Design a protein around this nucleic acid. Structure first.
Lengths: 49, 104, 49, 46, 302, 49
DNA sequence: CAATTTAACACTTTTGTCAAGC
DNA sequence: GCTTGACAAAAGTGTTAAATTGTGCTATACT
């Protein structure tokens, strides 16, 4: 689970670097939030991994 | 029953404080202004830069060894495009576009 | 935002909540809730409580 | 030890989190594949 | 699902056509060179006129907006290409994001002079990025790209051999069809294995998960540990029976104090003594110790 | 980018949703990049012009 | 493919073994 | 009580050679 967060987080740190469009950055932030939620609670929001 | 193991080989040394070795403490400052300390051994030289707890690379407080270690910036968008086109082509394209906005 | 970018600021995601609570006065909400409790009659008093 | 009277809980403002940590996990890799030693700057890093 | 929102988002913009992509790329290049000219003038500080200043500040921003529009137009293509790798290793939305990175690179290198459609050129970069991301991030224990390719080849020929010979192919058949030695194919086979979760449900239910019945082979066993603490003491006593000089060489030679197996030359600094005398003393002490009168005491810690 | 801790966002009651008056569904849309929220509005400047 | 790491060895140096004796 | 010379396998020198690993790039069109 922790790993899943890092993979997202690092990717975000790259997308902000090259100035990606707003849609991609928002999608990445949403993925990061969902990953953190799964790390703390698997199944509280949505369906668990 | 199932049997498992790690790579962490165990040692039966009972010397919690039996042996004492000399050490020296270096101090580093991070880019954000946070400072940390590291008790290096009294061996060879203290490293100039150290990866600290916060994750930033910190420089030795005393100050020495001004070596950026072969800086190499990544391929920029412009340098990345310069191969696909000639400089004259870009000059002509910019001039043509400036004509369009002149007419507007 | 294009018309009146100088007058107001909008945000989305967790950053929006962080920025919005950065200037949140804790005392005011409690005072308002107490006033509503001493003033309200029906469900409004229940919500304030 | 054996000197407790009460145990209390509370929120973490991420300053406690940055104080606890001995270093951040930069990379996702856990261990090398043919050798079984931990990978530096990742999970299980020594 | 958390993905349908993205599907809704990507429908905001419409598809492009060849000529549209052409002037989009032209505008991107023109804006980039306009930024370069800006930097060139600012190096000298040349006075960019007020009207020309606004015109250039418009053209460069229009180039950036053209880049954004071109990137946003191909999200459907990125998603369609990423949809092929669903259900193995990586999440669908992670694959979509990696394809988005690939599309960004394709736009970075896209050339309009060729007159080729953007769709054909993007599909190379998007597929490459998806494959790289799947190889790097699809396993807990990271195997390098070359080993991933070798494992994929092993799987492919294994399936082909199973289909052809119509039986469980022995490693010899795999080696023959792969032109590699049996040992290396066995190594790849064992590398390809996936770790089993430590939180399984061994026992048909949740009474024990997996690890309630695993014993540590590297456990600290008390009887041995305590015995060690005695052994040292015994040695500390036994070496006391020897003379000061005879006891010292054994202690320093084996480093019972510091731990370093000091060589004879180092031990020569006790009195400036040569190696040979220290060796003679060590052999004499060894003869004294190994006799039953002393060795019988220690003849259980073997 | 900052993230929200799930324990205090969901749970019925929503501790955050009670600390600030946003409805439980309003927070879900703001947090998961679905709807914008106005972080600050310069009332004095708007009234001036 | 270029970079990084590891095995490989023809050879040098530090180290350990005998016979002899001032 | 302890030292010099003759030998020896073992622990390193220094560079090169082979294996391993990270990396950018594929232009019919495909949404």
């Amino acid at each position: 689970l922790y790993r899943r967060v890092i993979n997202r987080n690092n990717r975000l740190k790259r997308l902000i670097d090259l100035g990606a469009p707003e849609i991609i950055v928002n999608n990445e932030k949403r993925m990061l939030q969902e990953s953190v939620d799964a790390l703390f609670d698997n199944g509280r929001r949505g369906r668990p991994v | 029953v199932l049997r498992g193991s790690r790579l962490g080989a165990v040692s039966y040394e009972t010397d919690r404080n039996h042996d004492l070795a000399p050490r020296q403490v270096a101090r580093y400052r991070t880019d954000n202004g946070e400072e940390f300390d590291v008790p290096f051994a009294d061996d060879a030289e203290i490293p100039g830069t150290w990866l600290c707890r916060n994750g930033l690379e910190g420089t030795l407080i005393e100050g020495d060894v001004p070596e950026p270690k072969k800086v190499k910036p990544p391929r920029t968008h412009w340098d990345m495009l310069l191969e696909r086109r000639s400089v004259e082509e870009l000059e002509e394209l910019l001039k043509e576009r400036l004509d369009l906005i002149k007419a507007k | 935002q294009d018309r009146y970018g100088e007058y107001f600021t909008g945000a989305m995601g967790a950053e929006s909540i962080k920025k919005l609570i950065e200037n949140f006065d804790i005392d005011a909400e409690a005072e308002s809730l107490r006033e509503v409790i001493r003033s309200g009659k029906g469900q409004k008093k229940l919500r304030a409580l | 030890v054996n000197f407790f009277d009460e145990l209390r809980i509370g929120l973490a403002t991420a300053d406690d989190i940055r104080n606890w940590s001995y270093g951040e996990v930069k990379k996702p890799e856990t261990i090398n594949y043919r050798t079984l030693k931990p990978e530096k700057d990742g999970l299980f890093c020594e | 699902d958390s993905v349908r929102a993205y599907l809704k988002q990507i429908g905001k913009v419409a598809l492009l056509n060849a000529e549209e992509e052409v002037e989009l790329a032209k505008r991107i290049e023109a804006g980039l060179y306009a930024t370069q000219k800006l930097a060139e003038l600012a190096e000298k500080g040349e006075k960019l006129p007020v009207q020309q200043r606004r015109d250039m500040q418009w053209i460069c921003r229009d180039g950036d907006r053209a880049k954004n529009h071109l990137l946003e137009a191909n999200l459907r293509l990125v998603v369609s290409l990423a949809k092929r790798y669903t259900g193995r290793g990586m999440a669908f939305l992670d694959l979509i994001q990696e394809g988005n990175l690939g599309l960004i690179r394709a736009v970075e290198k896209f050339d309009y002079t060729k007159g080729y459609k953007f769709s054909t050129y993007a599909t190379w970069w998007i597929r490459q990025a998806i494959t790289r991301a799947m190889a790097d991030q699809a396993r807990t224990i990271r195997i390098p790209v070359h080993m991933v390719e070798v494992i994929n080849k092993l799987g492919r020929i294994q399936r082909e051999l199973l289909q052809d010979l119509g039986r469980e192919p022995t490693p010899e058949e795999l080696a023959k069809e792969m032109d590699i030695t049996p040992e290396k194919v066995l190594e790849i086979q064992q590398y390809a294995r996936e770790p089993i979760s430590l939180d399984q449900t061994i026992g048909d239910e949740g009474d024990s998960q997996l690890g309630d019945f695993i014993e540590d082979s590297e456990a600290v066993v008390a009887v041995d540990a305590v015995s060690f603490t005695l052994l040292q003491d015994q040695l500390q006593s036994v070496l006391e029976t020897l003379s000061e000089r005879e006891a010292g060489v054994v202690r320093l030679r084996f480093g019972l104090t510091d731990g370093q197996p000091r060589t004879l030359d180092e031990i020569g600094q006790v009195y400036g003594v040569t190696r040979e005398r220290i060796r003679q003393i060590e052999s004499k002490t060894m003869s004294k110790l190994r006799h039953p009168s002393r060795s019988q005491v220690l003849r259980d810690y073997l | 980018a900052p993230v929200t801790h799930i324990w205090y966002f969901k749970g019925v009651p929503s501790r955050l949703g009670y600390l600030l008056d946003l409805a439980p569904k309003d927070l879900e849309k703001i947090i998961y990049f679905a709807a914008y929220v106005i972080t600050s509005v310069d009332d004095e400047m708007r009234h001036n012009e």
